[model samples]
Every structure is written in structure tokens, then in C-alpha cells.
Target: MKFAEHLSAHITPEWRKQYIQYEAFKDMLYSAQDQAPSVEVTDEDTVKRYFAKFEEKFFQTCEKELAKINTFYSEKLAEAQRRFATLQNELQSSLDAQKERNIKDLKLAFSEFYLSLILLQNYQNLNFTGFRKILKKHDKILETSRGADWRVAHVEVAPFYTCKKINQLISETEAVVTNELEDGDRQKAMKRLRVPPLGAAQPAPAWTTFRVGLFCGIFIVLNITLVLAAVFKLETDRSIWPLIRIYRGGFLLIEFLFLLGINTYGWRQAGVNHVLIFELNPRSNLSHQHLFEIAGFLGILWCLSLLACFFAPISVIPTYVYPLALYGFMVFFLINPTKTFYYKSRFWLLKLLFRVFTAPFHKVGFADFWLADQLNSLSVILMDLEYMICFYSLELYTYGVRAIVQCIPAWLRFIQCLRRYRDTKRAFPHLVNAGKYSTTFFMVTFAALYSTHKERGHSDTMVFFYLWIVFYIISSCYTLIWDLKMDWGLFDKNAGENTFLREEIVYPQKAYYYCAIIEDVILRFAWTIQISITSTTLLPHSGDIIATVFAPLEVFRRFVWNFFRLENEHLNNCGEFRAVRDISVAPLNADDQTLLEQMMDQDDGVRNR
Candidate 1:
């Protein structure tokens, strides 16, 4: 088979259609075998080489076409220049006889012609230096004519009107230029102009900067005080354990209620809009059935948590209820059952549980009584197994500490799910930051408990607390820096002379930053308070030491970690680029052809004048 026949056989229909449109492209491919010393013409390597060479030739052909267009426009511009000179000479000969309408018409015609020439010159990447000189001369002529008209009329006009007219002409010309040029030429022009392909970035406002600085300053001051208290041995009495528990319980309750309110609000909106509260992944098999399943699971968990808070030990009621609820939704929603369920019974919850327990017995084909007995037996055994697992799991430590460790993996998985969702769709930054913060908190809490258990010392426990502080600071800084860089990149990409960044641009950026900072501060303060409570309320008490001793190492560790994370993120954002294939050329439209013909006609009219 010939090269074209071989290509048609192997290539996709879309690719074939794109290349076959250009007769020159197909001719070049055929001629390539004759020009180059080749082995098998149909060899894979030879075909690849031919394809690469074809792209080069294709672009070269496009360039030559553009050059021809430039030559055509250049001659029209010359004819326009001659006509303009003739118009000026005629006006000079009969200054008083030239009507205002005639003069205005002349100026309008010349402005439009000049704008078209400039746009064509820019698009073709021809010598714009000569065009610039011509533009300057034309401007002087227009200015002198306007001045003469003003003197003749003795009527004052706006000083800026002349500049505004010129600017308007330029703007109008640019708007239609893209429509006139082919896609490749337009793309090249836009790339040269540094225009953003999507949307532009916006700068943060003054108020946002002030708010961020104020927020950070307040936290810094609060943190300094806490550091001093830790160093100075200013400790609360052990009798305050009950009070601490009450406070911690209150905080957790507030956190849960706040989250519940937000979730409720979101659900309300979703209901009103007739959409899912959260976006379901199209690639995954997740559906509304999965959503209902997850929601039911969370409802059960929430009920259990309430029961624990009321009946079980206060210490076992989980300190990070807010974080748990937030991540729980992500985890349960993403990893849900594929099976769908529909039922007629009003008591669906009971029926669901009954079905689960009785599922295995259904295959046994026993009588109702025997099936019920077997179901009961299986339920009892499962309960026993659950109790046995819980007993063994908590044999090492209290339920609270063990619970924190168990929840860490769930939170981490939740973060990964959030990131995946963000990659597919633009997620709220506040949610993303919240997920990271919660994950960090859980990890640090687990680390503290594990460290204290391994090495029981005041100094050792304090080291973990210090590490928590460092981690919190580093995480917050990382989030803030990442947000700023992303916003900056967007802003720079969209920056243009006429584009204005609105004050609303700062709102999202500031909102995310403020939330991250506020959460960091509150979480850090709460953490420090927790450490204080643990030291006083727990069996073993540790004495305070000078903060100066560990201060240097903590600072150094913070600096190193921040630098490492910042560098990695900066490199990632800066180096990343996405390439999309341009398989088809844009077709010429009637409007573009009409515009070219109109310009040619205008040039002929001017030359006749």
C-alpha cells in the first residue's frame, strides 16, 4: 500500500479527516519517500519520521500563507495612503468649501483602514516598525485637521475625546481581528500577547492584607503567652479535671452543632435545587443509593456518639468530633455499597437490619421458627465477636486514645478523596484546607499519645507537644503559601492593560486564608489547653521547664520543614504544563471573507478618489 493508504488503515477517522483536508499535506507525504533515502516506506520508524517532518512542513506552509496575506494587505494599505494624501490635498484646496460631514467621513474611512492594516500586520508578525511610523504621521494629520476645525467653528470640545476616539478604534479593531484570522494565527498572536487561555488571576485587596496581618498577630501574641506559661510553671490544680472535662465536652458539642448546621444548610440548598448535596464522582459507581447508605451510616454513628456522650464516660466521647463528622461524610460517601435497595415497608431501618442478620439463613430453606432461631444465634455470635475485638483492642489503653489512632487512617483517606475530587472539579479551598488541618491534628494527637505511652516523662511529653506546635504552624504556612501562589499565577496570566481586578477577587482568597489562620490559632490554643489538662488531671504530673531550652531546636525544625514543603510546592506549580492536541484546522467563515473583500473595495474607492 502507498503511504496515504497505509495511514488511512492505521489512523483514526478523526486524524484522517484533519490531514486529508489539506491536499498539500498529502502530496508532501507522498513526495517524502522520493526525497529521503528510505528502507521500507511502510516501516514504523520511517512513518514516524515522516509524520514529524510533515508537522514542520505544515507549519511552514501556514507561515507562507500568512506572508502572502500580508503582501496583499500591504498593497491595500499603500493605496489607502495615496487616497488619504489626495483627500488632504483636496481639503487644502477648498478649505471653506469642505463640509463638516465630508471631513468626518474622511477621518472615519482613514481610521478604519489604518486599524485593519495594523491588525493584519500584528497577526502576520510582519515589520510593525514601518506601520508605527505611518500611524504617528496619520495621528499628526488628524490632530492638525481637528485643530483647524475647532478654530473655524470657535466651539470648545472635550480635550480627551480625540484620545478616546483613537482608543475606541483600536479596541473595536482588536475585537474582530480574531474572527478574521485563522485559529493558528490567532493562537500565535494571543500567545505572543501573553493572554491567559482560561481566566485571569486577581490581586488581593488592602483590607484582606490588613485582616490577615491582624489575625496572625493576635495568634502570635496568644501563642507567646502560652509559651511563657509553659516555661514559668504556672499550672492549674489537679482538682480542675472535672472543669476541664466539662469545657472540652462543651467545645466538642459546639463543633458538632456548627458542622451539623452547615450540613443541614447544604442539604436544604441541594433539595431546593434538586441536586445532590455533594458531587458524585462520574468515574466511580457511586450513586444516590450510595449517598443514602452513607447518610444512614453517619446517622447511626451520630446516634452512637450521642449515646456515648450521655451514658458512657465523658473521656471516651472523642475530642475531635467536628473533624470526625467532616471526614466521615467524605469516607462513607466515597466507599459505599454498590447494591441498591428498594422496599415497601414504612419501617425500613428495622427491615434492613433484619435482612442483614437473616441473609445467610435464607439459603438454608428452614421453617420460619428455625430461621429466626438461626438468625438470633448468628447475631449473638457476631455480637460476641465484636465485644471480643473491642476487648482485645482496648486491652492496651483507654478507648479515647485508641479511638484517635483508629480515626487517623480514615481522616488521611478522606484527605486523599478530597484531593481526587479537587483534581476533577474545583472544590472550595476552605474545605480542602479543613481536611488537611484535621488530618494533621489527628496525626499529631496520635503521635503525642504514642510518645507519652512509650516514654513516660514530663520532658518527653512536652517534646511531643512542641512537635505538635511545629507541625501545626508548618501546615498552616504551607496552606497559606499555596493559596497565594495559585492566586498570583492566575492573576499574572490574566493581566492586561484593559482588564480590571475587582475587589471581590480578594474575598475568596482572604476567606480561605482567614479560615485557615483562625482554625490554626484556635486548634493550637485548644491543643495547648489539652496538654495542660492532661498534665494536671492525669495520674502523673510533670513540672514545667524553661521554654528557652527547647526553643532553638523547635524553631530550627519548623524552619526546615516549612522550607522543604514550600520548595516542593513552588516547584510543582511552576514546572507543571498541560498539552492538548490541535488535530483540526479552523474553517474560513463568510464574515471573514466579506471583511477582506470590504477592505479591498474600500482601498479601490479611496484610490479612485
Candidate 2:
């Protein structure tokens, strides 16, 4: 029996009459299947032929099941698609509603801010009556407004005495309203104040100027470069891969070397004397502050380069394990402060056990400790070097070399900073006593590590990095523009007894001096390593070209070299000799003298003993 024949037997004449169109559909399908050819099977091929026969028989018997399933799925799919579409539509509608609400809130905030401005005009007009009336009206509005006490408190309308007092009252109220408006909350009383005539539309975001221009420029250039690269790759009969690799590899090496040299030189120069001088002249040149800032920014660039390498298309690089390892080492280097975990005295046994069993090195300020710090900073400098080794070495073993090389710079830098700090402390004892000078190395390390953790693999990290670069550029450029803002006039040179005028030594110059020294030495060594590695390896791919071209631009855009100019300015205006002459310790008062005498007496007793 055929499938059509079985279907026909299932349907009665009455049922056929009820579903005439469906009955016709069945008749047509039956006619088509009846016209098809038949096949023969033997016992020898029974295994295969029996299954085929069974399938046909099953098909004949289960027409109703197939129809039911088709109907069920079609209905369910239609319902699911409709629901999905409906959800999408609802989401869009909700977003539109939110946008509308935001606009409304923004308008209301502007209205309040504008009203405050009008109140200011009223104050100038000496309209005391109008002012009082406005105040009373605002108070009444506040009575109705929820959470408006802060603004009201600022106004102090009840504390009015005379015209002068009333003027002050109006000024304070306006300030409160203005502040509330700026922060996106308005006092209810302020809201009730006479609404100002709507002025011209508020201007677009001021940043839009740069955003539109720069973002468009970046977009256009990226697209153009990508398009050209694609076209170049496609049209050429010859393999341009070799040339592209050479170009890109060369660029990467150059940039790595440049930054390594710049940072290393800066670091090596940041001795304890430099730090102390900077501290004594918190506003002075030769400070380790700028060096740390540079190191931090470079660290960020190096980290970004590593991340790019990790996530870049799989085709671009066969393996990313090496670069990822480098990134991890880079992070460890930037964040880790202490060089040695050596325990002295009773804890020496613990140190010995830990060193023998766990740590690679044991002694404080030992060659191993120095090596560790250098390794950390050097990782950043030798990023390109690690890339080369990974590319050339056998895939499995490459990661080990990559990891070790990455760490070498960090250890070296760490040692250099330590040495610089020691040297600076030995040279500048008095300047170290004041608390004004501080370095931001630790803070920067903290921020970098924290932000990295918070924004792991998030798109916003890229956004934040770009934003930070822009901010630094703007600030650096602005500081460059207003370099004269640090003129000697701001200092009260003759204020000998003025504690406020004295430069405070918040952090010892030694700490930052070490940081600078470590950073400089490690990065320089790393750069050298990178150059050597690149020279020996295969040229990087075109994708590497893109990175090579852009990485330095990105770094240069955010480098602390601009900050150095300010330092130079300080150096020219206030030399070390002049700084020393400027320092004036006032004669000790009765209390100080007595304390000093007691300290001397104690020292005498100790000596006699």
C-alpha cells in the first residue's frame, strides 16, 4: 500500500466532502507518487532493502503525523517570530520614551538655571521688593517640592537685615539654583520661581566640535587604509606579503626603541636629589613626577599593544599565547612596588624556607631582586623582542622565552629606581624633611591595574583609553600654553615663618627617584632587546603594519615629554643654588628650643652609658 492509498482509506466520503479543497490536494499528491518507479529487493540485500521498504511503509502510515508536526512547527514558528518582533519593537519604543523623558528633564533643568540668571539681574536692579516677593514665592514652591532643603538653606531668606544683606541673600539663592540646575536637580522652590522666557536653543556639546572632526578623521583614515591594503593585496599577482611584513616590522622596532630610549633616559636621571629638589620646589623642574607620568602612559600603550596582539584576527598571527603572557608580565611589572620580600631577624627562617621552596630569589637588594625589578619594567620596553622570539621559535617552547624576556625589563627598572632613590636621599636631607613634593607612580599603577580589572575585555576600556589620551593631550597643551602660570610671583619668598609657603614633602623623593630610575633603565634595555629581536625575525604582517604606524602616534599623542618643558622652565628660573638660598629655617621658639635641649641631654646620657 502507498502513502496516498493509506491516506485515502483513512478519510471517509463525508469527511472528504467537508474538506473538499484538502481532499483535492491529497488526490493530486497521490497521483504524483503513483506515477513514480518501483524497486526490487533480494534476501541477500535484505538489511539495506528491508530498511528502505520499512521507511516507505512508515511514510505511508504516518502521513497524518508528518502533517501534524508540520502544522505544529509552522504555527509555533509564526508565534515565536511574532513575539520576537514584538519584543524588538517594544524595546525601541521604550528607548524612545526614555529619550523623551531625558529631554524633558533637561528642559526643566535649563528653565531653572535660566530663572536663576534672571534673579541675578533683579539683584543688580536693586529691586528689593521684587527680590523678596521672588524669595517668598520660592519658599512656597519649596514647601511643595520634595527634597529641596539644601537650596533653601543656601538662600537664608529669613536672615535678611538691609539692602546689602538682601543682595547677598539673592546672590546665594541664585548660586544654589544654578548649582542644582547644573547637577540635574532643581529645588522645588527654585522651580516655582518665575519661569524665564525660553531663549535660543542651548548650544550643542562643546566637545562635539573635536569629536565630529577627529572621530570622522579617524574613521575615514582607517577605512581608507583598510581599503587600500585590501586592494593592494588583491590586485597584485606577486606576493606583497613580504614587503608588508618588512615595512610593519621596521616601524614597530623604531617606535619601541624610541619610547624605550626616552623613558629609560628620564628614569635614569630621577635620583634622590632630583626627587628632593622637586619636593622642595613642589613646583620645580627635575622632579620624578613627569617621568612617572610618562612611564604610566607608555605602560598603557604597551599593554594595549599586547591586548591588540591577543585579540587580533587569528589569521594575523598563528598564536597569541606569547603576547598574552607578555601583557600579564607587563601588568605585574607596572603594579608591583616592592622588589624583595626578604624577612630579617626572627622571620629569616621563614624567608629561607620560602626562597628555597617557593620564590626564585631570596635576599633583599640582591642581584635576583634587582633582576626582578628590571625584568618588570623591561617587559614594556622589550614588547617587540618577545613578539620576535614567539614568531621564530618552535610554537610550544616560544612562550617560555616570551615570558622570561617580558619580565626582565621590569626587574631592571625596579633596581634602577631603588638606586636612584638611595642616591637622592643621600644628597638631600633637609629638602626631604618638607612634605610638599609627591610622585604619582603608585597612584597611576593603582589606577591602571584597577581600571584594567574593572574593564576586562569591555569596549569601554578602549573608549576610556582614548578619552584619557585626549584629556592628557588637552591638559598638556594647555599647560604648555600657560607655562608662565608658574612664575615666581606666586611664591611668598620672604614669608620665612609661613608653614603654608613651605614646600611639603608628602612622599620621599627617594621613592619616585627609584621609580624613575627603574623605569628608564628597564625600558631602555627592553627597547634594545626588541630591536634585536625584530632584526632577527620574519617581518610582521600588514595588520602589524597598521599597529606599527598607529602605536607610536598614540604614544606620542600622550607622552609626558611635553611636561618636561615645564620642568626645564623651573630649572632655568630656580637652580639648586637658588633653591638652597631660598630655604629659611626660622629661629626656634622657647618650646622648640626646650625640646632640642632635652633631645641633646638624652643623646649625652646615651653616649655616657
Candidate 3:
């Protein structure tokens, strides 16, 4: 519409409600007679009040429209709720159907387990013939689920049933496959098949060490600062003041002791029972799980020990609380010399309790490392308390008790790791072998004791300090380098996939696993030797044990590596290779036999190349 005409036509009172055209009114007034009936103006206040009323009326009109829309939305919400129940029922039915299908179609053997076996072969570069033959013999067996094997009674089950079947098949088919391979190639193939999967890899593991050191340093510095600041600012000096320092020191000592004990115990168990669980088949030995339960018990006890230490600084609490707690935990560890806790049914109860109690303070969202990291931070706080005890013994008794209070969360985590390791070993034995690689606790303990002794001597020697710092830095660098290498490539790429690669195809993965095992084993053994050889190794070391432990650990680590290699070589040397259809089996029923024959025929066309 033309602007002038539209404005002129909409000058009535009805148009005022529809739109504002102040310019049009001004033009109309100008066009009118020069003295167009000089209108009387209202007072400024009255005029302002009139305009305000008009604005309010305008807003009322706008709000009416908004209210109508709001009502429409509210009605839609009610409709949605009415439909929700019906939709939910439909969804539930669909889900139930899906679940039934899933359970029914579930494979007897976990694909990951099979993949791990395949990877183990590929990693070792073993000939496919032997494994193929083993597959042929287990034709019917492999078709069933792992649970089916578990359902068989001991008397009904064969000795080394699956393993023996494969072994027998290999023995029978060896003659045929052996003729096709060179003498050296056949021997090499046999060797690779016998070896266990690789342990964790290890390069520098320096980052972790440095982080540990840095955490220790920061803790020591901050704690000392707080103590010093509190002491000098205190209103009076009292004997009770020294008591605070004593209590804190005692608490730190207790925590350190628990850390030392748990890791050492864990490592020892790892080498023996932990290794066996993963090394052996779960179907063969139901009793093997006991070792894991024992490990878990130790973990719980370790947590309880920390709780004792946590309350140690509380003067109001009975003086016996700390001692009693320590004693209780110690007894739990030593009471019975059983390899595993004998309580089978209750073992799960203990695990549930452990998880529930620790979940609040420890959580791994998507990643498994977050909880471990939080636990690592606790060491920093401990170091800080240690420094504080050394410098400001007075303020600890006064108003700063809350500082010690913050440690309970960390204590929870310390125990959590111990518990998880035990639980993991219980659930998956192969992981137990990998858990053997986490010997940081032992190494850190030695470092802590050594640091304490050095400080006591008032040794401000730059050379010694510099060397220690250098070791930490180098270790950190190595850790970074190795983490990068280990976290890269095929393993990293396909990590989200549920396939297990053999150690041969993924040497880096093997190296990483082996390194972790070696670290834990060496660290624990070193700690034990340190304690047995020198009762006061934590007191004052002549640096003799340090070099001694390092050399042997390195040597032992190398030896362990060779052992895996040897085992791998042995597995590679022997086995028959063929499609499963070639193996003739006598089924108990004609129907079963026909089903098996047809299945084998369909699967056999894809031969082992």
C-alpha cells in the first residue's frame, strides 16, 4: 500500500490500536490551516499519566496473545502425558522381544576369546594348520556356548576336555601337515602356539614416576607452608601442640605402611595364584577363584587400615582406635595362610560391598583411569602432611585438624585399587598377569623412605638431589615416549573393537603388558629384598641396595621377556591345519548328526589358507 494514503486512511481511533503513525499525524497537522483551532494542552504530569495508562493497555493486549499460546502448550503437554503410558507399553514389549532374541542367539563361546586365540597365533606367526585341526576336533563343542561346558558335572566333563581335544586332533593331524612344511618352519610353528599372551609393555614409565615425585613435592611444600604459617601465628605454645605433629606423623606412617603392605602382598599373589587363574581355564577349576577372593579381602583390609590412620589425629577418639585398626588389618592379612578366601558364595557379597562403599569417591566416566588418578593425588597430600609434621608440629593440635580430614577420600581410592586388582584377577585371570606390572607402590615406598632418611641426615648435597631429580625426569620422559608409542597404531585404532590381537601381531601391546608385569614384579621383589636384607633400608641407606635392586630387577625383567619368547617359540612348532568338515564325528542321534554335517559343510568351504 502507498505510505501516505495508508496513513491518512488509518487516522481513526480504531487505527490507533492497530499501529502508531506519529509522522503521518505530524504531516496532517502541518497541512492543516496555519491556526487550526489552537488546541488546549493538558498539564505535563496529567499528560504523562495518560500516556502511561495507554502503554499499560497496549501491554495487556500483547499479554492476552501470549496467554493464549501458553494455554495451547499446556494442553499439548497434557495430551503428551496421556499418550506416554501407551507408548511405554509398546516400547516395553519391543524391548522384551529383543532381549529374548539376544539371549537365545547368544554364542556359547565369546568371540573375544576366540579372537584372542587367533591373535595369539597371528602374533607368533604360527602355522594355521594345527589350530585348524583343533577347530575340526572341537566342531560340535565350539558350536555350544561356554556356559554349556560349565553346566556339565565334573564326572561328565572330560579332563582338559577342550584342550585335550585340540591336543589329540593336533597329534593325529601332525603327520599330514608336517609333510607340507620345511623342518625349520614346522618347528617354529609349533613353538608359537604354546606361549601365553604378552604381559604389559614398558618403555620409560617416566611420566608416572615424575608425576608421583611432583605430587610428593607439592604435598610436602604446601603442608609445610600451612604448618609454618599456623605455628608462627598461634596465640600460645603448648605441649599439646607437639602432640598434633606426632599424631599426623603417626598417621602418615600408618598410611605408608599400609600402601607398602598391600602392594607387596598384591605382587606376591600376582606371581602365584593370580597368574594361574588367567593361565588356566575357568571351567576346569572352580576352586581357583578363591585366590581372588583372598586378594579382595586384603584390599578391603587395606582400606580399613587407611580409615584407622584417617582418624588417628583425632585426640577425642580413643588412643587405641589407631592401634586396634592397624592390628585388625594386619590380622586379616596373616590369619590364615590360604591362597584364596574359601567363602565362595560370600565372595560376591564382599565385592559388592567394596564397590558400593567406594563409588562415591571413585568414578571412571567412560575411561578407566580417572579413579586411579584420583588415588595418585592422595600421595601428594601424604607428602604434604609429612613436611608439615617436620616443620610445624604446634598448629596441628590447635585449629587445623580439618586438613587431615580431607584424606579419607584418598584413603578410599587406595583401597579401591587393591580391591579392583583382586576382583579383576578373580573375573579375568589374563588381566591378573597384566596387573603384575603395576609395581609403582613398591617403588614409591622405597623413594619415600629414602627421601625421609636423606632429610634426616640434613644432607643438602646438590649432587644427590640433582641425581634424584634427574632420575625422575628421565623416567617421566620415558613414560611419555612409551605411552605415545603404546597408545598408537592398530591396537589403539581397533581398541574399541572386541577382538584380541595375539602378542606376535602386536608386539608393542605385548611389550607394554610385559613392562607393567615386570615393573610390579621387580618392584615388589625389590621391596621384599630391601626389607629382609636391611631392616633399616628405609632408615639410612648407603645407596648399596638401590644399585643392587635396580641391576637385579633389570636382569630379572630381561629373563622374564626371554621366557615368554621361549614359550611362543614352542607353541609355533606343531599342529594340523584343515577345515572342520574333514573330521568325521559320530553323533548320538540322526537328527543331530545331520544338523552337524550340514553346518560343517556350509562352514568348510571357507578353508584355512
Candidate 4:
């Protein structure tokens, strides 16, 4: 009969009702399969009625079978525990018997020594010659008794005669017992252990949600206000160039402070009590202590520099002089050691002696022409320091944001993994790298735009900036899309039949090593072109056209280089592809078959033992 015709003939009203109820049960089963089983049903009466209509005896048979299985497992577990206890008791008894034998032997040897001493004392009352002979006889007996041969020949020899041998045997027995117990414990622990799942969601408290919403609302309102201000400036045809810098700087400062707050909170949570004065070395020794001292010194100097920037408009300072002054101040703070000396100098003579001995200001005249010339040579060093600080701050800010984003998902996954074993999800592993590179690219773009916007009178530079932006957009889009395609293909080709796409979203160690060569080294080199254009000190040497033209070309070259590099490496490892293919296509080889047999034998051996 046709399947549809058969189904129609069987579809009575009772069967239809049963079928609909079965569908509802199937849905509930699927949902519950991914979660813990429920303790009680909400509609117990209805469930009981439905079950009554079905084969109640069939369910009772299932219950009986389940109870039998449970009893079998419990009995086996109890037998194993009992066997372990009996073995442990046997070993303990053997150890105790050996110890008791050794103790009795020790007592017997002590008794023999006491008797020999008493005999020697009793012979002391005789003549000198006779006493001497008796003494010699006693010494001879002592030497003979101490000898190994004498001890072995005499059947009544004290247990202490073989004390070392007995001790060695006892030690060996104890070691065996220890190993057996440890092995059994480890096996039982492993059998009981379970790995938890990842990324389970939890409900937040109402107050926390309210606070987060309020903060978000305030942030959005502030951003909207800034947008309105910008629009008003543009509508009036007034220059917003100055406003742009002020806004950017203000935003950067706010981000810096926010990150500082987060860092402080994290430090507190990590049990860091002292913010300052907590030395990394945590030792009184002077050798490694210098490292912490230097770090603390620099931290203090940085704070001073920040204060200087706050009080004295750092923007107004000459670009060269700003870094030179900062460097000089840092050096002064480092060399003075005022805090260190203040604590060391206690007595009147020490204080006077220190001041008099250190008074070389007059001798080395502070404004010497030699010093002036040396300062001129150090200009490049100071400028390099300034650039280092700028780049480091930019990178630090980017790292902070990426850390926050990555940490949220990481924390969620951690909690879920601890709670649920079967239904965990994974976060994209490359997301942090993507965020870092994207941030660097946008930073460079912003710097270029800011530099061009600031130079109101330079039409040529403005034209070059527009051209640079266009090239940047095209290059960035192409690199991003191409990278996505390459990564997808690499993962897709490597993914085996049973695995999911998420499980395959990981790079080999070698792949990351090669990728870093381009991302960290080459990309940074490309960014230098933009830095040179934006930097006042660097722009004199590079000019607008040279930097603008070179920047895009360098970026595009690195992007292409990375693409081909990863592709070449992937292709080179064709052995992996062949290995995977062989596993899927061929039957088990001799070695594999032997391994499987050995594994089965080991399991059986363990069970029987």
C-alpha cells in the first residue's frame, strides 16, 4: 500500500489525538535533552492520565530493568572498595610484623652487650695477668659476634644481626603499598572526573541592569550633544578645526582615565593592596631591587610630567623643547635620590658632610658650553623618546579596549564551563588580533586627517590627504575581505567530517608566527609613513607627496605579502591533507590494528585485575 493511503486509513480520532500528544512530547524531549532533567512535571494529573491510556505495564518493565542495572553497578562498586580495604590491611599487617621483629632483635643484642660488660667487671678482682687474659678473651668474643660470618653461622642470632636487610625489605614493601594505593586513587579519581562546558548565559540582577542602562543613556546623550555642537559650527560656516582637536584630545583623555579606573579595579580584585611602594622584587637585596627602584622612579617622573602638561599648556611648548625638557626633568629626578637620602641621613654630621661633599655645582658650572653642545647632540634621542611615548600610548589604549572586549566573553565562557558540561559555545579566537590591527589602521588614518585638517592654508597637503584617504579605504577593504576569504578556506580545507566550523577556527603555531611578521613588523613600518606626515618634527625631511604616495603602496605590499606567505605555508603542509584523506579512505593499517588490539587488551586486563 502507498504510504499516504496507509497513514489515512490508520488516522482514527483516538490515533490523531495520540499523535498530537506524541509531537508535544517529542518537542519537550528535544528541549530537555540539552538541559538538566526536570524534578517534577507542572501538570502531573494530565501526564498520569496520558500514561494510563498507554501501556503502563511496559513502563513498569522498564523501571524494573533500570533497577536491576543500578543494583549491579552498586554491587560491583562495593566489591571493589572491599577488595581495596583488604589489600591495604594486609600490607599494614606485614609492615607491623616486620617492625616488631626488628624491635625484639634490637633488645636481644642489647642484652648480650650488657652480659659481656658484667663478666668483664667480675674478672677485675683477680690478679693482673689473669684479668688481662680474661679481658682479651672477652674482646675476642665481642669481635667474633660482630662479624657477619658469626651472625650467619649461629641459628640463635639476634634479629638485629640482619637489621639492615630487614629495614630494606620493609622499605620496599611500604613503597609497593604506597604505589598501589596511589595508582588506585588516581584511577578512581579520573573515572569520576568530568569536564564542564563553556559560555552559559546567566541572568543579571535588576539593579545592575538599571545602573548599566543609566550609564549607557548618559553616554549616548553626551555623544548626541557633541554631534549637535559640531552641526551648529558647520551650519554657521565657522572653522571647527580647533574644536576638532579639543574634542579629540578630550576624548582621548577620557578614555585614558576610564582605562586607568579599570586597571585600578582589576589590581584591587587581584589582591594588590599597595598601589605604589609595592616593589616587584619584594626582597631587601640591593641587586634586583634596583629594577623596582628605577621603575618607581620613572612612574613618579611620568606623574610629574603629566602635572607639568596639565599646568603649563604642553601644546604651546616648542615640539623639540617639550621632549628635551621632559627628559631633563626625568634625569634630574633620577639622579637626585632625595627620598633615598632623606631616610638615610639622620645625624647632624652626616647631613652636613653630605651637603658639603656633594657641593660641586660651582666646580662644574651648570651653563658650560660643553654641556650645551652635548645637549644639541642628544636632540635626536629626546625626539625618539617622544615618538616612543606617542606610539606606546596609542597601542596601550587599543590594547585596553581589546582586553575589555575579549575578557567579557572569556569570563562568560569560564562561568559556563564550570556549570554546564554539554552545551558550551566558543568565542572567535582571532577576534583580539583583528581588533588590534583594525585599531592601528584607524589610528593612522585619524592622525593623517588631523594633520591635514590643522594645516588650513596648505591646499596641496589637503589634496594629498584626500587622495591618501581614498587609497586607505580601498586598501583596507581589500585586505580585510581577502584575509576573511583566506582564513575561511584554510579552516574549511582542514575541517574533518565530524567537526563543526567553530571547532576548526584556530591557526597553527607556525601560521601565527608567519602572520606576525607581516602584522607587527611590516604593518608598523607602513604606518611610519603616516606618522612622518603627521609629525611636525618628521614632516620637514619627508614632505607631503613622498609620505602620501609611499604610505598606501607600503600598506598594500605588506597585505599582499601576508596573503601569499600564508597561502604558501598552507600549501607546503600538504602532508596533513593527505594524512586526513588516507584516514577517511583507507582501512586500518597493521600498526593501527595492533594499537587498537593492544588498547582493548589493556582495558580487559584492568577490569580483570
Give each model's whole-structure lDDT: 0.35, 0.35, 0.34, 0.33
Tell me the tens digit of each residue's lDDT in model 2 across 1-609: 111211222222332222213333344335434543444434446544644563354334334333443343344334434543453455457557767954334434433333433322322232223233333443443232311342244223322212243233334444544453235444433432223222212333454444435544554554465556565545336543433332343344334434544543343222112222222211112222233333344334443343343345556554445344544554454344454321121143334334323332332222233233223322333555545455446443232353344334433433333443454444332122111111112222222433454446677666655544454344333322222223111123543543222232112133542343344334333333332233222234533444444444433422232223223322333322223421211111224455676755444555655
Whole-model lDDT, model 1: 0.35
Where does the lowest 10-residue lDDT sum fall in candidate 4? 192-201
Model 3 per-residue lDDT tens digits across residues 63-108? 3433443343344334433433343354456557767933211110
Give the alpha carbon lDDT tens digit for every residue of 200-277 in model 1. 112334544454455445545644654564466443553423222222332333233233333333322211110111
The true-versus-predicted C-alpha distance at residue 78 of model 1, in Å, is 47
Error of 2 at 230 (Å): 5.1
Against the true structure, candidate 4 reaches a TM-score of 0.21
Local distance difference test, candidate 2: 0.35
- Residue 207 displacement (Å), model 3: 42
How accurate locally is residue 278 in candidate 1, as Cα lDDT from 0 to 100? Answer: 17
Query: Which structure among the candidates has the greatest TM-score?
Result: 1
Per-prediction tally of clashes:
2, 35, 48, 3
